């Protein structure tokens, strides 16, 4: 159970905070709360925890 963050065209969220980003963990505790893990890896939003249920990058064959 590991993904990325996406938005709303589908663009994933990267960032210049790795490890613990906090800036990763509030915008990755937004909708649904099943995750637990939120950090960035490889300067990109990754929470880690959620199901797929949850939404997570790459977003479905469409790209962003």
Do not use: A
């Not at 990267?14 to 950090?39: A, M, P, Q, V």
């Amino acid at each position: 159970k590991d993904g990325y963050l996406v938005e709303k065209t589908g663009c994933k969220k990267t960032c210049y905070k790795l490890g613990e980003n906090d800036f990763c963990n509030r915008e990755c505790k937004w909708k649904h709360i099943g995750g637990s893990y939120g950090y960035c890896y490889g300067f990109g939003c990754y929470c880690e925890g959620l199901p797929d249920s949850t939404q997570t990058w790459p977003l479905p064959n469409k790209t962003c």
